[PDB]
Amino acid sequence: SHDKQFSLFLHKASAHGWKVAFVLEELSLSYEIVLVDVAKNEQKSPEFMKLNPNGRTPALIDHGNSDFVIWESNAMVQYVADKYDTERKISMAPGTDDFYIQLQWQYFQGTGQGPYFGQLVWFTLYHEEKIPSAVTRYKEEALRVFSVLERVLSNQEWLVGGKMTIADISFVSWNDMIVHFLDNFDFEKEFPATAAWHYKMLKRPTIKRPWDERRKLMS
Amino acid sequence: SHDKQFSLFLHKASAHGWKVAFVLEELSLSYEIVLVDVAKNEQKSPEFMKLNPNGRTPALIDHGNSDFVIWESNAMVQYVADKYDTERKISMAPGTDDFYIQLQWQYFQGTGQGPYFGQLVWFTLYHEEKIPSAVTRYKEEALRVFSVLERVLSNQEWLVGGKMTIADISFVSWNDMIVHFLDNFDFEKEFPATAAWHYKMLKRPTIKRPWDERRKLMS
Ligand SMILES: N[C@@H](CCC(=O)N[C@@H](CSSC[C@H](NC(=O)CC[C@H](N)C(=O)O)C(=O)NCC(=O)O)C(=O)NCC(=O)O)C(=O)O
Numbered sequence: 001s002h003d004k005q006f007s008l009f010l011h012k013a014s015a016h017g018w019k020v021a022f023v024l025e026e027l028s029l030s031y032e033i034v035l036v037d038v039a040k041n042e043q044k045s046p047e048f049m050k051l052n053p054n055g056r057t058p059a060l061i062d063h064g065n066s067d068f069v070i071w072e073s074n075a076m077v078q079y080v081a082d083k084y085d086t087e088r089k090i091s092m093a094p095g096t097d098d099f100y101i102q103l104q105w106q107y108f109q110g111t112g113q114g115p116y117f118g119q120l121v122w123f124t125l126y127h128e129e130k131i132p133s134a135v136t137r138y139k140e141e142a143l144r145v146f147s148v149l150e151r152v153l154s155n156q157e158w159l160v161g162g163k164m165t166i167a168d169i170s171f172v173s174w175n176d177m178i179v180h181f182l183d184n185f186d187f188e189k190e191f192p193a194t195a196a197w198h199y200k201m202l203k204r205p206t207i208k209r210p211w212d213e214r215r216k217l218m219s
Numbered sequence: 220s221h222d223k224q225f226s227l228f229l230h231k232a233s234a235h236g237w238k239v240a241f242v243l244e245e246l247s248l249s250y251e252i253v254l255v256d257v258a259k260n261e262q263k264s265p266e267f268m269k270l271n272p273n274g275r276t277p278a279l280i281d282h283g284n285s286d287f288v289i290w291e292s293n294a295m296v297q298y299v300a301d302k303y304d305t306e307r308k309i310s311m312a313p314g315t316d317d318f319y320i321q322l323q324w325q326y327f328q329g330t331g332q333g334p335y336f337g338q339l340v341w342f343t344l345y346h347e348e349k350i351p352s353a354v355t356r357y358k359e360e361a362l363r364v365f366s367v368l369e370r371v372l373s374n375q376e377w378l379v380g381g382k383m384t385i386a387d388i389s390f391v392s393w394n395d396m397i398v399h400f401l402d403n404f405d406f407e408k409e410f411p412a413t414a415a416w417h418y419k420m421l422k423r424p425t426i427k428r429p430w431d432e433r434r435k436l437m438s
Contacts (some may be wrong), residue, residue, distance in 0.1 A: 005300070016394055040251045049370075052263065052326060053366050053367055053370045053371050054331065055367070056357060065316070070319060070320065070323055071323055072323040072324075072326035072330070074326050074330070075319055075322040075323040075325075075326050078319065079319040079320060079322075079434055082319075092321075094314070095301075095313070097284070098314050100289055100294060100297065100298040100301075101289060103291075103297060103298075104289055104290055104291045104294040106294075106328055107291035107294045107326075108273060108291060108328045110326055110329060111291070111293070111329040111330050111333060111334060112273060114330060115330060115334035115335070119338065127352070127356070128352060129350075129352050131350060131352075131353065133346070133347055133348055133350075134346075134350065134353060137346070148272050148273050148274075151268075151272045152272055192275075
C-alpha cells in the first residue's frame, strides 16, 4: 500500500468519492485514492464488500485510526470533519444547533440531490428503453433542486453558519456533472446565486486539483 | 395550538414523518402531529416553505429549543436522539466511532432505501404513464436493498453497538410499506434475518403506537 492516513476507494465516474477527496484536501489530510474498477464489477467483489456490504463506492479506511472502515460518502465526510477539523475551518461545531442544520443540508444532498440527478442520468443514458416522460420527470426535479438552493443562497452567503462548510461542498461534484444532462443549461442565467456559490468553491485549489485529477482519468 | 414539546409536520402516507414519530415515542417526548396534505399540494404553500425550502414533509419544531426548525427526517431523528436520549437507550455515544457507523446506516436508509422505494411506489401508482421496465427497475433495486441488510443481520442482530438504535428503527416504516409493491413476496422466506429484525421492532408499543395511528389515518 502507501503511507497515507486515509485509503479512499472510489469509482472515478462517481460524484461521491471526489466529494470526500475535496473535504480531505480542505483539511490537509493525507490520502491515497484506490480506483475501484466498476466496469469489472469490482465494487461487487467480496474483497470490496468486506468494506461496504452495500457494494457501492466510496469507502474510506482511516489508517490513522486503527484501520477504521466507513462508507456512505456523506458519513465519510462527517467523520473526517467532526474528528479532524479541530479549528472548524469548514465545519460547524458538534453539539451546537448549527451542526444539525449543516447535517440537514448534507441529507438534502445525499437523499435529495444525489438520487434524483442519478435517475436523470440513468434514463438519459443507461435505461434500456428511451422514455421521455421519465427523462422529463428527473430533468424537472434537478431544476427544482437548483431552485431550492437558489431560494436560500440568494439570501445568505452559505448554507449554514456564515461560512463555507462541508454542507456547501457536498453539492459541488454532482452540480458540475449534471449540467450535460440539462437542456441548454445556462447556470448563471437560470440560477445566479447558486452558480456563484458553485464556482467560488470549484475555484479553490483544494477542490480544483482533485477534480482536475478526475478529469484526466475520465479521458 | 398545543402544549407538547414538538410540532411534527408530516404527510400520512409517507414513511418519513412516522420514522420521526417512532423516535419521539421511543424517547418519551410529547409532540403534535400537524398533517400537511400532499394530495392538496400543501407542501408547496408559502407557510410550509417558511419551514422547509425543499417543500417536502416532514419538518420539526422544538419548542424546548426556542421553536428550533429542522427538516430531513434522518437529520431530525439525529437531532433528538443526540440532544435528548441521554441514557443512550437507542443511540450510540456522540463522539464515538460507533456513532459514525450509526450515521452511515442512516445515510444508507436516507439515500439508498427511501429514494428507490419511493421511485417504485411512484411508477406503480402516480407516474403519468405505465412503464413495466421502470417498475421492474426499482423492484429489483428494492430487493437489492433487502439483500444488503440480510447480509448484515444474519451475522449480527443489530446494525451498530449490539443494541437497537435509530439506525435500525429508521428502516421500519419504509420496510413495512414496500412489501405490497413486490409481487409474490414472502419476507421471511426471502429475507429471514431482516424479516425477524423488522417485525421485532414493529412489535414495540413505542413503535406500534404511531404506526397504528397511520393505519387509521389511511383507512
Ligand atoms: N429526504 C426527505 C424525504 C422527504 C419526502 O420524500 N417527502 C415527501 C413525502 S410525501 S409521500 C411521497 C410523495 N408521494 C406523492 O406525492 C404522491 C401522493 C399523490 N400524488 C397524492 O395525490 O397525494 C412523493 O414525493 N413522491 C415522489 C417521490 O417519492 O419521488 C413529499 O413531501 N412529497 C411531496 C413533494 O415532493 O412534492 C426526508 O427524509 O425528509
